[PDB]
Amino acid sequence: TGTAEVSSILEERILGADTSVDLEETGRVLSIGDGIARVHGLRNVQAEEMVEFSSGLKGMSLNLEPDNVGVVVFGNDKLIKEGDIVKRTGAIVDVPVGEELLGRVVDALGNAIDGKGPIGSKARRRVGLKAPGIIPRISVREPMQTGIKAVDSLVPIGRGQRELIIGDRQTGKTSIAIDTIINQKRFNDGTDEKKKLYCIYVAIGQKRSTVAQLVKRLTDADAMKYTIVVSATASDAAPLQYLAPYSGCSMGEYFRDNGKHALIIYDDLSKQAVAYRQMSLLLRRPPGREAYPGDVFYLHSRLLERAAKMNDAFGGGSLTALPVIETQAGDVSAYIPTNVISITDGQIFLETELFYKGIRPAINVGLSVSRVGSAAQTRAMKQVAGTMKLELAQYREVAAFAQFGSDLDAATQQLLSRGVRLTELLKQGQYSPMAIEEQVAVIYAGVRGYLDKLEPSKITKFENAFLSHVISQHQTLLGKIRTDGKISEEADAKLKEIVTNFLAGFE
Amino acid sequence: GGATGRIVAVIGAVVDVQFDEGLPPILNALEVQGRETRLVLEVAQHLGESTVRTIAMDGTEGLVRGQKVLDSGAPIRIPVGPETLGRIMNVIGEPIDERGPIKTKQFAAIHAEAPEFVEMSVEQEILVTGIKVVDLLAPYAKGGKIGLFGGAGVGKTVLIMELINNVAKAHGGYSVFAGVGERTREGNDLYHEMIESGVINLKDATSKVALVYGQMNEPPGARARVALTGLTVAEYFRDQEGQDVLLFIDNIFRFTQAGSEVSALLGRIPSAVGYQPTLATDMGTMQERITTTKKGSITSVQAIYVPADDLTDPAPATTFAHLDATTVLSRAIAELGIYPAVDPLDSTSRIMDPNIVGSEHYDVARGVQKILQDYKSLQDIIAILGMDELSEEDKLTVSRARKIQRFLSQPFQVAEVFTGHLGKLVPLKETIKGFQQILAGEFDHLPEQAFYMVGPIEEAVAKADKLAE
């Protein structure tokens, strides 16, 4: 009943002592399944270790069950045959990292796929290293600005943390990632090393044409200085989609060990869980719940808890993880959304009735929360977003009473009106991230309540005209806001004056 | 190369063959002799003493333990050319239209890699099919994976007939139909309607659709790989023909059913709901082979079954992950009476952006979706008390949204026998003007049944004049 007990290796064992295949560095391929070889030999291989197949392929080896090495094939299983010769490489699989990976779409073993030349990497980091502990890291001390006003006001991100974008399929959720990338152009144009940034978009099991659309959007927004795009599409193999987030996270770990800041966007991390379930169930590892095996939480935690700000001794480098989860019709109670919501330090939740109700971007909150999302803000946005969050918290209770709000009292009517103006301030066009200074100005206008008399369909037109007016005329005021970091009574008085005058001359 | 082997264990498709001289690699083709027909085997895993575990495509009634198979070096090779146009072939490569053999010169191998990242095209141009709810709420893409989901009895086959008619006649290039486990009479009506409409010409080589049809009662190796046969034919019409080609795969859920059936029998642990663990990987291969490249432009409309209107089944969810512009074909709006019961509130588009299509089209589409989404919560407000207390404006937008939702219905030309109405063609600009004219407040007085089964807004005017006087 044994797996290695077949008459081929038994016959070559008892017809005469071989000592010829060496059984330790090499190994002959036994039963090759749909994507998993169970090779015989490799007595000196270690666990999770990348071997190569004589076709010219690679493949990483797990389960070792006392006579057999469970090597999962890094490619198509058409050209691996029974009896082929495997060879050890000698090391757990590495990822070529460096500052030469930037602006070039690569593939999860660290090899170039866009065909515009090879990667000029100088050092290879071992993938799947342990996360840094308690003392080497510190908390979120820098504000990570998405550019989305709803996110940067209500649920801001911190340079130093992990923030799980969660929603149904085609409910924003990658547009927020592309806005998070394109927002960092203005911080990567100039000075301040502790502001400049490196985005890493790890696409796991997407279509490959949408990765081409993603990289064309980033190139014509000139988003290829900050960015690396790691891509393991749906045509690629199951273990190469499994190993894609750890590769990009190793690149980001290179960026945060050397002082600099970085973020990573794990697009379709649920598909990484699906690929791991595929390869484990074909390794006949015992399935846990929904056929996901035991160490799936251990997988996503070992992936996601590598993101933290570092103390001033260990550079000042920080990482920001942004995993992405498709839920199936709001089923937040599934296996993978419950696992990653228990892992991650915040969630950005997108319920979709807001999207088709016409408030885009689709961050439909109340379930959405950031567990550190007050200290990860500039004091301008801290003040304005604190008052704005309390106003929306008073608004969202009474909206079912606002569908019949016409025949109620006046205090509600004022509160619900202010909430409607703020909720239509939070909507924003796609692929146009706002800087912190102008969104502080807009949400300031909404909080101080120079909008309560206007029509609802005229709020967004006011928003665009107010952006044009404040960018064109009052450059120095946005300079005050972005250099002081806050409104200190003179920006307050000047904004009183300019918003009263522009409301006097709007129509 | 042609190495002989012994069938030793037979269960359906899953047939174990023992090779001891020459072992064929995985995903191959074995010709079982001894049958009066040919039997083909898709070679998979090699378990030992060399053992291929193959899946057998024809019915295995009558396979002896210890039969002789022949081994060729083919993944599986099919006749492919301009000769295979007006003729129906099945997955092995053989004609089932009873018109002799297919005389071609070069063949093609069914299994290939999805091409490369550097060959992926980047252009996105709108495709207008003449259907209202498609043209404004989920427009198509010349060079994009169009998918239309639905349960059973929602109208996917009538919609795919309307697309085949209204697009394959409005196409100078070629077409490829792939009936992947579609029932035999609907494909038969397709073949006879194609002959009588003239897109298949039985007299000479003036045809422009190539049909690959695997019936719904074949073993799962013949019902999974027939989609790949359609992919191979339409790849040749895209790779080195140099032609804009469109492929209609109806109905890729038999692919996943076939994979789940063999994975039950191959010896693999069942995944989530009961499908194979290799669902996302296998469908990733066969849905990333089908995309437009820099060499040629190929557009793929896919009729995709969901089981009993369950969109959270993992195979429709991963199919959503592969598309570019889906279209949900619900049932509830046909319990209302709108056909096909299209959900645009669950439909997507990569093509719908204010720079791609326009600002006018985008704003009227988002206005229609905004007023239909608001109509749901407002209708649930109605459902307890009624039309009494909503408001002036609230009752006005309820009636306006209901009028729009009745205006989404459109009589198909191929479905002039289900409703009796003759069926019309609507251009894009007319759909934009009609929905912008209903949102603009022009038609607040006409009844809801005046907009029900119409084409342009002039047809709604004529039906309102017919109902009134």
Partner: peptide
């Protein structure tokens, strides 16, 4: 019952409960 049926039923009665509080106010 099935799961989606009870999800539909809970959605319907949560909406009826909110609208009935609205009628109460």
């Amino acid at each position: 019952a099935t799961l989606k049926d009870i999800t539909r039923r809970l959605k319907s009665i949560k909406n009826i409960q909110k609208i009935t509080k609205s009628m109460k106010m």
